[PDB]
């Protein structure tokens, strides 16, 4: 039985917060209790820890903890540092004890709870401690409320430090207002000139040209989906009839070179076939002529998670009146069943969505490329010579690129490393490119675990792995072509479904075990049962064409 | 003294503070400087400092009202957490050496001298109790 440590009661002295409980199958003599954030940047030992058998009480001081200061705004876990840490899971007694002592109006408010996390949070609001200056003020509040965080599915101590807006002298305030006004005017002038040049450039042709434009705000140089379309075009002598132009930007928030700033709208107006791959906000602010075509070759493969208008009414989604994805004429998807979901996503007619196959998947059905890439990955990563290779590859837990994050602490390195040692297998990790965290690797960890977040080719590693522990990413689509099983780490399924759900129900869509906790991983891999009998139906259904000729069909459909 | 206070605070390595001294809390000291707080009251009885947070007349949790202490001296080890959290300083800073003003209560000669002096200056204390 795994050693666990629980929280039994939460006291509150004047400013001093107490946590008491017990642990099983664990000697606490050399325990080092801490308060560690989800992002793993702040650890702070409990000021006093009194230990009596398996029972314990931890004396936490919210006034002197942070190296002498107060606990800043964050969410903290109670972690028993040791050779192996332990995140203290709340006993169900605590959440039972509150549940029976609701006053009737609390019960009336209690019924409108969607999931278990809302029930948990509302029941645990009776352990809240709010510190207001003088006890009256409602504008400076230091509140600590124990709760099970939905995003990390783990007990945390949310500390919210509400502070008033502190304003500087009137000179600085006037300067800030003037700077904001100048920035707004600059943005308005840039939008005006962009619209003007684009509108003028298209208005001087009014005819069918021979120019093809590839654009992507998040792909420096030509690569990815465009590369296969471009190569298929060049193969059948389509560079001897059309002229091809490319406008690229390093990232969404980056700025553009002097030439490209005004070359992009000119080509947008002039181009008959305009290519995009992802959110390209400079295109959804203009109006196109009918003869033009805007081809949306989405990076991902299938309709797994919500995108575009399909998340309207949800946080981070566009209102139904926006033009954020509507200026398309031919959006290309990999399966027939993706037509309604993706047409809904882009807000375009369903005839604009064609099931030809995403050109990026051209290589997954190839054979010479398979041996080539296998040799390359064996030579450049000799550690993959184990009996089996496993690949962790979760998606970002944040709302978007601006809020990119991942609470890695959900993964315990040591147990997976011990499984690898027992099984002579290697597990590789590839966080999403929209991440901000950096992996940390220990002594035995380096001998099995490999941090892979730099490799340019996304599908580089999928050719070698004999498993895939991913939760929500579209990587399962590409990996599905190899007749291999995968395990799904549905760690925060309730919260994620609440924020952005899936175009299909999660429990049945996934081709593999569903898994919520780490123990479920050691159960699945230790027992070596994965339910791969359903990955072949998934590949059969969610891939319309298995010929590996997606780029050929895309170019044939677009140009003839 | 208006000119002497900031200059002396800046250049003095050891600084002794007896009670609430608001000026010393508006500046940041070097790590070499040792700011010492020797509280007038002997022991920890009535809620002082950051322990009044949430009560009327109590500082906010983020205030710097007693933080700039390097050492605080207390009567006994059972006051280390109370006074450490009252000043909002680390528990290592607070040390149980005893209050300097309690050094006067154990001297026999002064006890006898002050007994005679109080007998003289208060004739009423001639009584038994
Ligand atoms: N460890 C990893 C995991 C994934 N990848 C690549 O990243 C691309 C998208 O992955 P992900 O879906 O997670 O990103 P988004 O949320 O922005 O996709 C929004 C939505 O359109 C899409 O999911 C679709 O399935 C639903 O319509 C894919 O090409 C993956 O190969 C990677 O390089 N490394």
From Swiss-Prot, chain B:
Identify the domain of life: Bacteria
Q: Where in the cell is it found?
A: Cell membrane
The role this protein plays is: Responsible for the polymerization of the main chain of the major teichoic acid by sequential transfer of ribitol phosphate units from CDP-ribitol to the second glycerol phosphate attached to the disaccharide linkage unit. Synthesizes polymers of more than 40 ribitol phosphate units in length.
Family of the protein in this entry: Belongs to the CDP-glycerol glycerophosphotransferase family.
Q: What is this protein called?
A: Teichoic acid ribitol-phosphate polymerase TarL
Q: Where does this protein come from, organism-wise?
A: Staphylococcus aureus (strain NCTC 8325 / PS 47)
From which lineage does this chain's organism come?
Bacteria, Bacillati, Bacillota, Bacilli, Bacillales
Gene name linked to the record: tarL
């Amino acid at each position: 039985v795994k050693s666990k440590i629980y929280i039994d009661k939460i006291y509150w002295e004047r400013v001093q917060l107490f946590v008491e409980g017990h642990s099983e199958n664990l000697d606490l003599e050399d325990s080092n209790f801490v308060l560690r954030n989800l992002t793993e940047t702040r650890t702070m030992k409990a000021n006093d820890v009194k230990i009596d058998g398996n029972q314990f009480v931890c004396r936490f001081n919210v006034a002197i903890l942070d190296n002498g200061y107060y606990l800043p705004e964050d969410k903290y876990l109670l972690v028993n540092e040791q050779e192996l840490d332990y995140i203290a899971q709340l006993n169900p007694d605590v959440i039972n004890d509150a549940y029976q002592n609701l006053k009737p109006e609390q019960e009336e408010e209690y019924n409108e709870l969607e999931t278990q996390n809302g029930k948990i949070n509302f029941l645990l609001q009776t352990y809240l401690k709010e510190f207001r200056k003088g006890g009256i003020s409602k504008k400076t509040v230091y509140t600590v409320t124990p709760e099970i965080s939905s995003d990390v599915n783990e007990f945390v101590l949310d500390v919210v430090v509400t502070t008033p807006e502190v304003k500087s002298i009137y000179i600085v305030r006037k300067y800030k207002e003037l700077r904001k006004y100048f920035r707004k005017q600059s943005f308005n002038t840039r939008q005006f000139i962009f619209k003007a040049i684009f509108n003028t450039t298209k208005f001087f042709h009014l005819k069918k040209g021979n120019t093809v434009l590839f654009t992507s705000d998040s792909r420096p140089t030509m690569s990815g989906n465009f590369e296969y379309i471009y190569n298929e075009m060049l193969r059948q002598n389509l560079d001897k009839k059309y002229d091809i132009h490319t406008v690229f930007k390093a990232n969404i928030t980056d700025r553009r070179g002097i030439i490209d700033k005004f070359r992009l709208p000119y080509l947008l107006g002039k181009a008959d076939y305009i290519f995009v791959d992802d959110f390209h906000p400079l295109i959804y602010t203009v109006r196109f002529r009918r003869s033009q075509e805007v081809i949306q070759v989405w990076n991902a493969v299938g309709a797994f998670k919500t995108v575009g208008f399909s998340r309207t009414g949800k946080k981070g989604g566009p209102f139904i009146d926006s033009l954020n994805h509507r200026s398309y004429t031919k959006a290309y998807v990999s399966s027939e069943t993706d037509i309604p979901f993706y047409a809904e996503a882009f807000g375009i007619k369903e005839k604009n969505v064609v099931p030809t196959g995403v050109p990026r998947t051209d290589v997954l059905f190839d054979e010479a490329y398979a041996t080539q890439i296998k040799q390359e990955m064996e030579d450049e990563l000799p550690i993959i010579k184990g009996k089996k290779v496993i690949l962790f590859a979760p998606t970002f837990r944040g709302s978007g690129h601006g809020t990119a994050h991942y609470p890695f602490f959900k993964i315990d390195f040591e147990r997976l490393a011990r499984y690898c040692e027992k099984n002579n297998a290697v597990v590789l990790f590839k966080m999403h490119p929209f991440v901000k965290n950096r992996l940390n690797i220990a002594d035995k960890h380096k001998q099995y675990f490999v941090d892979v977040s730099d490799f340019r080719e996304v599908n580089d590693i999928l050719f070698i792995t004999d498993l895939l522990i991913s939760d929500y990413s579209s990587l399962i689509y590409e990996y599905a072509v190899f007749k291999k099983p995968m395990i799904f780490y549905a760690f925060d399924l309730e919260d994620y479904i609440t924020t952005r759900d899936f175009y299909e129900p999660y429990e049945s869509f996934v081709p593999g075990k569903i898994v919520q906790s780490f123990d479920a991983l050691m159960d699945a891999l230790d027992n070596e049962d994965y339910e791969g009998e359903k990955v072949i139906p998934f590949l059969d259904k969610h891939f319309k064409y298995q010929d590996g000729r997606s780029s050929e069909r895309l170019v044939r459909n677009l140009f003839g």
